[PDB]
Amino acid sequence: LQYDKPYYMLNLYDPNKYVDVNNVGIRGYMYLKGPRGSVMTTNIYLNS
Amino acid sequence: MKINNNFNIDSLIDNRDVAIVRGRKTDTFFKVFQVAPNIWVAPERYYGESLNINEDQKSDGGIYDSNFLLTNDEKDEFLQATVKILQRINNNVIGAKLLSLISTAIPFPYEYKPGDYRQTNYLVSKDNQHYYTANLVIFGPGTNIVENNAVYYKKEDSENGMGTMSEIWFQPFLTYKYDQFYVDPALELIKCLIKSLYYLYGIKPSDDLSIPYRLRSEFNSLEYSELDMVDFLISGGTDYKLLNTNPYWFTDNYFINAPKNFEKYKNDYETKIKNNNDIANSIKLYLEQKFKTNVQDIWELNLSYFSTEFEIMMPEIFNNALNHYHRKEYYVIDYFKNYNINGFINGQIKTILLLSKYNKNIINKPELIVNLINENNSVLMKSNIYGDGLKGTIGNFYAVYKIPYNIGDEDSCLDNVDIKEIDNIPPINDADIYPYRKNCDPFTPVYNITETKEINTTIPFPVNYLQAQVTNSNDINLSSDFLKVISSKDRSLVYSFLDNTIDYLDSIKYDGPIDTDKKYYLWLKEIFRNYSFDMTETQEVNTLCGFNKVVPWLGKALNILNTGNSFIEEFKTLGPISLINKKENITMPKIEIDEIPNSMLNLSFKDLSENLFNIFSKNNSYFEKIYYDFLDQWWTQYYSQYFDLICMAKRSVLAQESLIKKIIQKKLSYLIGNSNISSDNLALMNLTTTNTLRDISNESQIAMNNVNNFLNNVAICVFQTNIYPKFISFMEQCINNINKNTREFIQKCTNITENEKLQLINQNIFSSLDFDFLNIENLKSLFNSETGLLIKEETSPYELVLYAFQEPGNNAIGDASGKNTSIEYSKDIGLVYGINSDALYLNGSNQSISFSNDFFENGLTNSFSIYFWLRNLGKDTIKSKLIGSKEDNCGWEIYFQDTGLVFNMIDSNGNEKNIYLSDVSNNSWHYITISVDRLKEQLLIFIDDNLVANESIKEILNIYSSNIISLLSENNPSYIEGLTILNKPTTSQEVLSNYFKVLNNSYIRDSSEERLEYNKTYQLYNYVFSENPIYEIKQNNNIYLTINNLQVSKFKLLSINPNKQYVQKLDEVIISVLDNMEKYIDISEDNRLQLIDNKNNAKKMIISNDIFISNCLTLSYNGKYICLSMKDNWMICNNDMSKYLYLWSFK
């Protein structure tokens, strides 16, 4: 793991959800939402 | 949602929430209470089944009481219990979503005329002027009071997507104990609710659709017990893991048709109904919410998911065929005493339930009667083997099923459900309900008629041994001859396999009577130790599959290979496959593979290659499906017998445990009644015998886990050595044929050149790399489950693990072990960082902590361990108490004394183990561990990581003390961190691992074991010269640091960032010396350590150390460390000397 290197977030409890911000400010918060989507190329690979 | 708990059996009828309705079309009427929108409870027996039925019409394993739920008090109890379970389920988020879904999953209205819809879900009042909307009504049980069930209002309407009402038979008062826990009735209610979901969405399968469950290996005939589709889809367990595979090896037309019908009725609603004003908007909203969740979501709901979400322990292996394995025993649950919103009060294991009166009424009609007979056909032994209530077919399902070559394969189970949206829907009033007359099928009770057959055997079967190991006599002689046990006409002996315990009892057969409590303690301890060495003993053996924990007593527990000298020798010379009866059971699945289409002959090279690639992918997927089918077949055929062995062995262990407890209790009662022992000694004897029985239970659980793991491994190895080679051979033939066909097809193509023909031929071959699906981790991970994790954490050896931290406002201190240990601590105890976490700071006068836990009382035969981090800040030689449990001079304790510690163990009889530990109180952290092992009778004391004491406590009897462990640390302020008490003895390897694991947290420690930090005035020392500090002296117009074989130099570390406080491993440092003006370090040309004044000229060294050493850090620069120089003694940056020279320390 390295500093100054953007990373996307994943949670081990609920992989299907990803991190998003509701709003920016004091009253804002961070939350999880889905579905993760899927990238597929037929007969070779299919992953979230 | 809000469950209405303000209803009693005598509430007045309001025509809205509580009413009296009619079941089906019969003239029977009953009272119902609406608990939540569209869900009602009928606190009465089910009207459809007659309360009394003929004796031969009784279902085996079922309890029949026609007087149950009869009086109004029983009905009110049922109502309150059901409402309490409803509240418990609703409190959890997933249970609340399930309840909202059931509340909104109304059956589809029936279009009597185009544009005219009539409801199907309705209840008719007594005089037939009030109609009630209800998706589900929960009744009491039918004829059998333990038969929870759910039935549909109309068959066809619930089969073709329209949906019907559901009616539930529920038994909230009875539960059964599986292994070591009581099954939560909330989970059974959840299972019935999910079945009601299947009924409400009209996705009920055809009755003939049923996947196989077990192979009836008890019979001498080939027969498969197959489980219904809904039961398999919603039961969960390990069996559901052999069907829910990606890709699906088992598929049926039902899984295609059901979404079709769902979408059809969704279109019917959204086109015809949603735009129709003929019906109330309530039905519109209910249907909108019903159709918002598809059929896949309903399919993925099963008891494994709810067990994980609700944290409920459930059966996980063959959980729908328990009536053959687990002859249940029933316990009554008092919902005001033994239940609350959080399930069983004090867990599913630690709660106590009164045995139900109905256990004697359990009907026992066995599917088989096994009769052990001798040469002259005399009936020696007789036993009953029970069925499972599952349809048994005579045809092999695996040899008839056709794995679909052509199929299409593509979140939270109820993520789309909105509880708030469903709650906001106003209810359906009585004045806007137009019923449909033929909405109810005529209910017919179904009676299962079991068949009984006999078998005569010359060799005892496992059930013969299992039944011969139980007895009702209270004067038990544990014998060692099953033939003699059966032949014993006196009915006195009872069969057993505990050779150590039997031999010990034979040795003290002529021993003098136990007159005093000391002899009783000696006898009880010896009996416990012999029992634990008989039961928990295992032996590692190397078989054709690996290292396995062979448990030797199974041969004498289940009559498995008693012919040979020992169980292990037979297990090795015969292999795993010998542990079962029916060993050649695998048949080749019926498989069809589409040949290459001829229309591709006139295709270009690229298109032909792409089609061949698609064929290759489909063939690989088909081979994977064949492997999944083989895996399921191996389970259902071979692991069924091994799990029969598992359950039989666990039952044998429980029988032996009960026999031993009988012996203990009879001896204790005889001593109480026929001895001159003082009364207080009798009271303490009873209190100690209780704890000894608890420890015996724990040892039994250990043995059960051992046999479980051993047989699981044996079954996996059977799959290795017997099923996979057959799969490999069949797949080799199949790939050979497919390669031949593809090669011929390519050679027959016309639009392809010869070189391209060779290219395509070699590109689309099949070899062993395509059907090599074996994966040991998946085969051993089938048996992992949420039940296993919950049992593991509930029976965790950690009785106490103190955790401490600082929250803005206060400091939190407590137990993190999950047990019932209560903590009462003086609120003037601060927390300061110790080694890895916070540590309690004790003044030594008024700071007290008290840990209350039953196990802390200790006893005669409980092994335990105490370890922690101690840093004394005192100098008192007086024997001052530090920590321990001491009631009436009896117990264990540890006091400060001199500059070290004293460990004291005093039993009731006066025997005292007093040990002294030197050099412990030095303003430095020490990792103290004590391990009292009552099995081998060993006392181990470790300081830091050295075995400082290894004594024998063979002469220490009962040390029963108070449940309170008190941390006082008299007269010495001190730091105490990571206090931990386990109920298991600790070995040296575990102590070393814990020591290094806690220490190795990427922190740099000085000589005081504390945390080194920046901007702190330390003093440098060498590991070799720890007694000799570092001095600064002027020479050659410079200043140099050296030892003497001189003003001691003051050392500080500096970091680049001013936001860093402590010094972590593997980081840059600038060494600084405090002179009249501060100076920094540098390395000169001769690698000597020079003192400079320039701020930026000083270069950055690197700090590291070895994890094997607590605090001997090393300073390096550009790959070359700093080491002591030759005598002349300064420091040099050279690596042509011994390793000890690089080591350093700070103070």
Curated annotation (Swiss-Prot), chain A:
It is a multi-pass membrane protein. It is found in: Secreted; Host synapse, Host presynaptic cell membrane; Host cytoplasmic vesicle, Host secretory vesicle, Host synaptic vesicle membrane. Coiled coil: none annotated. Has 3 functional domains; the translocation domain (TD) and the receptor-binding domain (RBD) which is further subdivided into N- and C-terminal domains (N-RBD and C-RBD). The N-terminus of the TD wraps an extended belt around the perimeter of the LC, protecting Zn(2+) in the active site and may be a pseudosubstrate inhibitor which serves as an intramolecular chaperone for the LC prior to its translocation into the host cytosol. The RBD binds transiently exposed coreceptors on the host presynaptic cell membrane. Responsible for host epithelial cell transcytosis, host nerve cell targeting and translocation of light chain (LC) into host cytosol. Composed of 3 subdomains; the translocation domain (TD), and N-terminus and C-terminus of the receptor-binding domain (RBD). The RBD is responsible for the adherence of the toxin to the cell surface. It simultaneously recognizes 2 coreceptors; polysialated gangliosides and synaptic vesicle glycoproteins SV2A, SV2B and SV2C in close proximity on host synaptic vesicles. The RBD specifically recognizes the N-linked glycan on 'Asn-559' of SV2A, SV2B and SV2C. This is Botulinum neurotoxin A heavy chain. It comes from Clostridium botulinum (strain Hall / ATCC 3502 / NCTC 13319 / Type A). The gene is botA.
